[PDB]
Design a protein around this ligand. Sequence first.
Ligand SMILES: CC#CCn1c(N2CCC[C@@H](N)C2)nc2c1c(=O)nc1n2CCCN1Cc1nc(C)c2ccccc2n1
Ligand SMILES: CC#CCn1c(N2CCC[C@@H](N)C2)nc2c1c(=O)nc1n2CCCN1Cc1nc(C)c2ccccc2n1
Ligand SMILES: *[C@@H]1O[C@H](CO)[C@@H](O[C@@H]2O[C@H](CO)[C@@H](O)[C@H](O)[C@H]2NC(C)=O)[C@H](O)[C@H]1NC(C)=O
Ligand SMILES: *[C@@H]1O[C@H](CO)[C@@H](O[C@@H]2O[C@H](CO)[C@@H](O)[C@H](O)[C@H]2NC(C)=O)[C@H](O)[C@H]1NC(C)=O
Ligand SMILES: *[C@@H]1O[C@H](CO)[C@@H](O[C@@H]2O[C@H](CO)[C@@H](O)[C@H](O)[C@H]2NC(C)=O)[C@H](O)[C@H]1NC(C)=O
Ligand SMILES: *[C@@H]1O[C@H](CO)[C@@H](O[C@@H]2O[C@H](CO)[C@@H](O)[C@H](O)[C@H]2NC(C)=O)[C@H](O)[C@H]1NC(C)=O
Ligand SMILES: *[C@@H]1O[C@H](CO)[C@@H](O[C@@H]2O[C@H](CO)[C@@H](O)[C@H](O)[C@H]2NC(C)=O)[C@H](O)[C@H]1NC(C)=O
Ligand SMILES: *[C@@H]1O[C@H](CO)[C@@H](O[C@@H]2O[C@H](CO)[C@@H](O)[C@H](O)[C@H]2NC(C)=O)[C@H](O)[C@H]1NC(C)=O
Ligand SMILES: *[C@@H]1O[C@H](CO)[C@@H](O[C@@H]2O[C@H](CO)[C@@H](O)[C@H](O)[C@H]2NC(C)=O)[C@H](O)[C@H]1NC(C)=O
Ligand SMILES: *[C@@H]1O[C@H](CO)[C@@H](O)[C@H](O)[C@H]1NC(C)=O
Ligand SMILES: *[C@@H]1O[C@H](CO)[C@@H](O)[C@H](O)[C@H]1NC(C)=O
Ligand SMILES: *[C@@H]1O[C@H](CO)[C@@H](O)[C@H](O)[C@H]1NC(C)=O
Ligand SMILES: *[C@@H]1O[C@H](CO)[C@@H](O)[C@H](O)[C@H]1NC(C)=O
Ligand SMILES: *[C@@H]1O[C@H](CO)[C@@H](O)[C@H](O)[C@H]1NC(C)=O
Ligand code: NA
Lengths: 728, 728
Amino acid sequence: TRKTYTLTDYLKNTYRLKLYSLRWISDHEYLYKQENNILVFNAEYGNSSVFLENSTFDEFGHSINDYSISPDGQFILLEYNYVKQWRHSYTASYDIYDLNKRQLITEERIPNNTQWVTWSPVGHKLAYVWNNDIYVKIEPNLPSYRITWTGKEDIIYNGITDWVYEEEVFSAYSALWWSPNGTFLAYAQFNDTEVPLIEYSFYSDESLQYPKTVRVPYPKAGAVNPTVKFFVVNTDSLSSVTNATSIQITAPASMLIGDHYLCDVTWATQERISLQWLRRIQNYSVMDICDYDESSGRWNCLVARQHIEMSTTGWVGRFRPSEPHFTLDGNSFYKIISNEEGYRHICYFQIDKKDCTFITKGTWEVIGIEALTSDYLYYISNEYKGMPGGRNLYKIQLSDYTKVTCLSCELNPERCQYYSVSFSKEAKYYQLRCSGPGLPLYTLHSSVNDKGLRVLEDNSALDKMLQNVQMPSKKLDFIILNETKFWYQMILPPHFDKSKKYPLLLDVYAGPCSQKADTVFRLNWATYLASTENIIVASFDGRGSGYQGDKIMHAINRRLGTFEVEDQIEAARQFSKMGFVDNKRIAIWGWSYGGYVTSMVLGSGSGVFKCGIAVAPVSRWEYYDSVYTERYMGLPTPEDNLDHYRNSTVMSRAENFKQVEYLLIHGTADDNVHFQQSAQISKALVDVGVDFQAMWYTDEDHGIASSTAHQHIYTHMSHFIKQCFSLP
Amino acid sequence: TRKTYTLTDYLKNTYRLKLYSLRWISDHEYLYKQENNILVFNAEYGNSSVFLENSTFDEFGHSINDYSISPDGQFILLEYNYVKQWRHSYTASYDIYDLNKRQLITEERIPNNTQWVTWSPVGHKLAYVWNNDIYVKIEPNLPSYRITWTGKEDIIYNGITDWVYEEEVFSAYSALWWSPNGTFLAYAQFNDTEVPLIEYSFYSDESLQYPKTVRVPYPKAGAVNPTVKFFVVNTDSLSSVTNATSIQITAPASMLIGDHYLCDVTWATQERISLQWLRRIQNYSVMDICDYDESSGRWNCLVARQHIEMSTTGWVGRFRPSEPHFTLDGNSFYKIISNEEGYRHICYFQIDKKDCTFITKGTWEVIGIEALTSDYLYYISNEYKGMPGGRNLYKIQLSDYTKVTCLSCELNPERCQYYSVSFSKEAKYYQLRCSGPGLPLYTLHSSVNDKGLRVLEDNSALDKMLQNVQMPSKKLDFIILNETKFWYQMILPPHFDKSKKYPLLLDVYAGPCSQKADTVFRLNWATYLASTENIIVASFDGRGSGYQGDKIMHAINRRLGTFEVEDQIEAARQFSKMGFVDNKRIAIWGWSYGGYVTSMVLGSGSGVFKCGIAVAPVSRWEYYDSVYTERYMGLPTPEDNLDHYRNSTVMSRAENFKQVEYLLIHGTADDNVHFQQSAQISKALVDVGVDFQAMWYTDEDHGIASSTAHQHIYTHMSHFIKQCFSLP
Ligand SMILES: CC#CCn1c(N2CCC[C@@H](N)C2)nc2c1c(=O)nc1n2CCCN1Cc1nc(C)c2ccccc2n1
Ligand SMILES: CC#CCn1c(N2CCC[C@@H](N)C2)nc2c1c(=O)nc1n2CCCN1Cc1nc(C)c2ccccc2n1
Ligand SMILES: *[C@@H]1O[C@H](CO)[C@@H](O[C@@H]2O[C@H](CO)[C@@H](O)[C@H](O)[C@H]2NC(C)=O)[C@H](O)[C@H]1NC(C)=O
Ligand SMILES: *[C@@H]1O[C@H](CO)[C@@H](O[C@@H]2O[C@H](CO)[C@@H](O)[C@H](O)[C@H]2NC(C)=O)[C@H](O)[C@H]1NC(C)=O
Ligand SMILES: *[C@@H]1O[C@H](CO)[C@@H](O[C@@H]2O[C@H](CO)[C@@H](O)[C@H](O)[C@H]2NC(C)=O)[C@H](O)[C@H]1NC(C)=O
Ligand SMILES: *[C@@H]1O[C@H](CO)[C@@H](O[C@@H]2O[C@H](CO)[C@@H](O)[C@H](O)[C@H]2NC(C)=O)[C@H](O)[C@H]1NC(C)=O
Ligand SMILES: *[C@@H]1O[C@H](CO)[C@@H](O[C@@H]2O[C@H](CO)[C@@H](O)[C@H](O)[C@H]2NC(C)=O)[C@H](O)[C@H]1NC(C)=O
Ligand SMILES: *[C@@H]1O[C@H](CO)[C@@H](O[C@@H]2O[C@H](CO)[C@@H](O)[C@H](O)[C@H]2NC(C)=O)[C@H](O)[C@H]1NC(C)=O
Ligand SMILES: *[C@@H]1O[C@H](CO)[C@@H](O[C@@H]2O[C@H](CO)[C@@H](O)[C@H](O)[C@H]2NC(C)=O)[C@H](O)[C@H]1NC(C)=O
Ligand SMILES: *[C@@H]1O[C@H](CO)[C@@H](O)[C@H](O)[C@H]1NC(C)=O
Ligand SMILES: *[C@@H]1O[C@H](CO)[C@@H](O)[C@H](O)[C@H]1NC(C)=O
Ligand SMILES: *[C@@H]1O[C@H](CO)[C@@H](O)[C@H](O)[C@H]1NC(C)=O
Ligand SMILES: *[C@@H]1O[C@H](CO)[C@@H](O)[C@H](O)[C@H]1NC(C)=O
Ligand SMILES: *[C@@H]1O[C@H](CO)[C@@H](O)[C@H](O)[C@H]1NC(C)=O
Ligand code: NA
């Protein structure tokens, strides 16, 4: 008899997905790390040469975290002493190695505790941030030019984001944007002076006698936000004698009237930059297009080149206004925007014209624009077979919009329904990455005639291993609620028998623009629950879910904790009526927004769920950050949306937990969803005399991701679900 | 069939013990509250009158928390706006009511947020502490005189204790002492400038958007301690001089050589005060006896009147050096000290002679000196029947020490074996308070002839109620280990049958000078466990326990987490040897020091215990306060006792927890045993992959005493014990 996929298999990563992570360095070559050696591959033929031997740094004296080869291939940036900060931020030490003279550069080294470093896009200039100030190195062995002098820990951030911009706006620590050929360096400056601090204890190793208090400028909903300024510096006119002059680009008048954000920076040409600004009430955004004036050294943003993007039904963009993709001359661009039917499609803009022309249309959405040439635009969409949870690459002929070709749809329809893509420098080649429903498949293609050059990685080794395991299956289907189709997935146990009743676990996210029903192949906790424990693990995309148009997405506008909560209950009610589901054994679980929805469901008094687990849940919107919360909720003021902020808490539902078994888990050092959120849930449950199970994770953050805490949490949750379902 | 004593009976306090709380106002009268009316009783005859009708403050506008009548009976101090701080400290608002005029005083009111207030011992002067400075009011309606100007929040404390002195030294917030007739006001000043702060989050009501960080000067083991100064001011000079001088009394040279504490303040006469000082290495203490010098206005402490108290085997006193009881003329005093055999007995001293005379002796101990007259000294001891867990009142003739009468031993020997006493102002009457083994019994007696005047409260109403309940019984006995008697108690289920095997729960304290085997009657969680669940709840007093001499008490000197832990394991083995214990169902639990011992036992690898519960445990001695920890452990330095501090942590035993079921509980706002202590236990368990159960209590302190949290904790623990013992 063959083995099942066990909890130890998941926790010890027994069955590994192989990847093929390449780095394009030109229109024809890519870098690939093989056996700690870095190889260069020719895309046309697939032949390679060793670029950097793994032994080169055997005598380095430090464990190298990562490497970054300069665009010209002359230098390599060596990252070490990595110290994680938030989701994207970290500090590290850096050394530069000259690849031509085969030596480490010992002169004018990048300092220790560097916050961010990046090569220019061409050549080998460097820009780095240290102690919140920007520095530029024209040559790796030469002294740095100090760009900013205002940097102050937790107050002034130059060229790096503060907590909320890192997490919610840029999904990055960097706030530096080099011009295409590296002449200019654009940067944002954030000012957190009046932003309140979240404070929490950090216990550290047992040797620390007194716990430390961590203090982070973090704006909760309605609190004072950071302010932002934007600048551009010419790196070709830097002096060792004079301080660098940064030219400020001010936000338009429509933004300066009140609180606002900088939400996108995209260079158009060597002398043209586009910026998008968003109002704090996130349903109005403005793009400025700014040109360098050689005679005055100034950057001018013509009012005739402004582009307004607004929404009457919700917020702008999926999580923020989309990025423009400019043509070679920068006189026009392509951008995904919500059409008049509420579906996100590609619109073609002229820099000086208000009206844009939609180039795609239909009841499906463009996910992202991937590459642009003079003849074609390449994009990913969920058009294929009307499956919102599938993704394919398409190209559209720019001279005739009726000519749309799917490039990935028919490559392997049974194995591959979810693709991402990586194009070479001028789109001569593309790597397709299939992530499901079958095992991931990486292939290389040439754009001229869409030739399928070669298979890069097909996971045939994992396929051989999985043949000896009783693996679960995945069913992707839909239910109809008020004439609308809503999709769900079920992770089904091996040898699934529709005549038998299985316990069911509802795995929830259900936040705005979420998608939990898709064609992706995953090896996770749900795999173990289905394979070993014979539990069906279901997920449902109801109102507020993404990639299906604004009628669905904006259904929860100004109303979090309403329809998306009701829809998870309705899906389980419908699944409970299916002949293969044991209605006495339905559970629910989620992390983050999914933890909030799980808690709201468990306190709804529906009677559908026996038990559930919330991990690091939001419990009250006033506790969460301004950028994410206000995007959907507006402001917690009597004149705006305070009543709904007050009616959407988990704490108000405490009495309804009397009829369920609840497990509440939270890391004590969570800088994102503060431990406070779960501390208020437990206090509300104690106040009404409801018993429940709890677990805190000392010094773990939102990820509960340390090796030992990851193993402990899944072990604890597994015991809980098994007890709930009467499983030995 | 009679009902059992259920968990709801305990939690809802259905079966209530009646008390008889009187307040002596003179040598022959006491105040007592009946139906919210304050009555005044004549002790000789038992007749009463309404002192203050319950209607008096109906139109006050605030709920009155407490009251204090001035010694002269002219005024009443009304306490309201009570806001609890630590174990003893709190702030409140106060109004004074003129009893003669039957009018509330509206001018020169005691300010809001007053920290401490006390009448003088005679008349009606008041001393109070506000914003860490001392003030004196000669008359209730007249302006205050400011005594100190140095008070500073968390830094300088005048007339009030800091955290550590409140908790570990004085067991009181007050640090002021009026002279017997109120002429002088003595006070201590604490300086916490360099004392490190414990910091923790306080979440508050759900309306609070950002958690507050509570910061308290708290010296952990070996950290910088507060410093102390002592002053005496002449309150009779206040209305005559602009700024009356506070005369400092400095500590002796033997104390000034290093860190020290002020540990006792006792006035001897109108012009003589005694002070006891203790070295930071708590095995050396010095008493100074200081006289007012009328010519110089200074206080002088003659070296011929200095008394040294030291210990070669342990620390000085049970928890601190004992207080002296002076004869009327202040030329001699009585004090409890450890004799040559290590038993605490009453010693009689002349103020200027170094050798004292023991007036009691034997293999038993004096617990406290209760009253002293010109002819007799009254004390409580555990002499009766050689039972260390019993307490009786004795009277010794000062002109003939062979004449010792037991005043309470034979009053009701079956019902009453644990007494406390309350004497009238000049010891003319005494109230005896019997607390077990039967129901509490309160009686009044005349000192002139030792006759019983009347029964004040016999708990007959509760006795009638308990007749219809299947109550557990209590066994108090001893086991002989290494030729030493060690006492234990067992709460036995109703209809206890020694031919049956019962599950056993070991209820642990086991700290130095602890006593868990006694004759007190209690209605608590153990009552429910034995009555409803048929669990034997046992407690054992092993090495380190109190009231049995220093050979037992000092056995754990410099070695906490050793013999007292081993002795609890041995006790459970000895209980199994008795034949009525199911060896497969032995559990252990404790709170505070008991929580540390429970955790050390569960991590010992003994195999004796199936499960256990630790509530707010100490986990590492370096995390606990200096005064308590260092008393037994010395300093955590390589030269002193660091090796043992490092060897006695719970965390080092984590791997052994794989053999047991553990439940760890802690209040997040515990200022005493910091949440840090359990946060370090959980992290060590996660690190070795041990599954366990946990529960935090938001904003609860060391007592987990709010009505809702108290009910929640005992409910949670009851489910855990029942699950461990396979009880439905
Ligand atoms: C509070 C909150 C929130 C909303 N939120 C956001 N946004 C946009 C990015 C910045 C962020 N501040 C807010 N992305 C989110 C979520 C979320 O709740 N859950 C997820 N994702 C994306 C990753 C996948 N999941 C779901 C998820 N997340 C975790 C952590 C899981 C852990 C184990 C198993 C499944 C999991 N599934
Ligand atoms: C850490 C530590 C410690 C030692 N400690 C001390 N000393 C002297 C007073 C100042 C203090 N800082 C240190 N008194 C203590 C204890 C203790 O561990 N347990 C107790 N008592 C006295 C009352 C009864 N119990 C046992 C008990 N049993 C229950 C059920 C409790 C419940 C809530 C709070 C305390 C409890 N305590
Ligand atoms: C980064 O940190 C290292 C170590 O602190 C610095 O390297 C030298 O290292 C030794 C100890 O490892 C010290 O005695 C010296 O003070 C260090 N200084 C020099 C100038 O060699 C190193 O210099 C730091 N790097 C930068 C760029 O500041
Ligand atoms: C990158 O682009 C910049 C801006 O277009 C180029 O700088 C200009 O170069 C021409 C020389 O042919 C001069 O006439 C301009 O005055 C320069 N402009 C500025 C703003 O400095 C630059 O040479 C390009 N660099 C590379 C390496 O291609
Ligand atoms: C942006 O959204 C806000 C809030 O929904 C809209 O505000 C108007 O102003 C207040 C709400 O604060 C109400 O009196 C109106 O009913 C709102 N208009 C609506 C709901 O249509 C604001 O109009 C929105 N901006 C755009 C461009 O749609
Ligand atoms: C207890 O009873 C005694 C005696 O009846 C009361 O004492 C006083 O007795 C004298 C006898 O001449 C009466 O004139 C008074 O009525 C009593 N004086 C006062 C000041 O009350 C005594 O009052 C009673 N005590 C209480 C507290 O009611
Ligand atoms: C409380 O103790 C602190 C020291 O812990 C004293 O502060 C010092 O005061 C002197 C003036 O006599 C200064 O020269 C020092 O700079 C201070 N040191 C620190 C560490 O603050 C303080 O004076 C004491 N206060 C009282 C009222 O006794
Ligand atoms: C009362 O007397 C005390 C003791 O002299 C004064 O306290 C001094 O105040 C001054 C500044 O105002 C400081 O320089 C000294 O360090 C203080 N000493 C002590 C021991 O506290 C106090 O200010 C006087 N009050 C009035 C109203 O004069
Ligand atoms: C309380 O005791 C104090 C201290 O003995 C008394 O004050 C002294 O009284 C004598 C007269 O008996 C004078 O010689 C001294 O000058 C006083 N000393 C001080 C320091 O004030 C006081 O009179 C007693 N109070 C009462 C109300 O009896
Ligand atoms: C690949 O092969 C071609 C010749 O056929 C050669 O020009 C080139 O250097 C090779 N590229 C690499 C990256 O090894
Ligand atoms: C940051 O903002 C504050 C106002 O909140 C202003 O005082 C300060 O000058 C700013 N600093 C910089 C460098 O812009
Ligand atoms: C550059 O600016 C900084 C900060 O204001 C100043 O300290 C420094 O003297 C300046 N250097 C020159 C060359 O002007
Ligand atoms: C105490 O506070 C109340 C309300 O703020 C105020 O009306 C009253 O005057 C205060 N009492 C004193 C003695 O300051
Ligand atoms: C006090 O204790 C310390 C540490 O045990 C010791 O070195 C010193 O001799 C002690 N004093 C007495 C009187 O035993
Ligand atoms: Na091919």
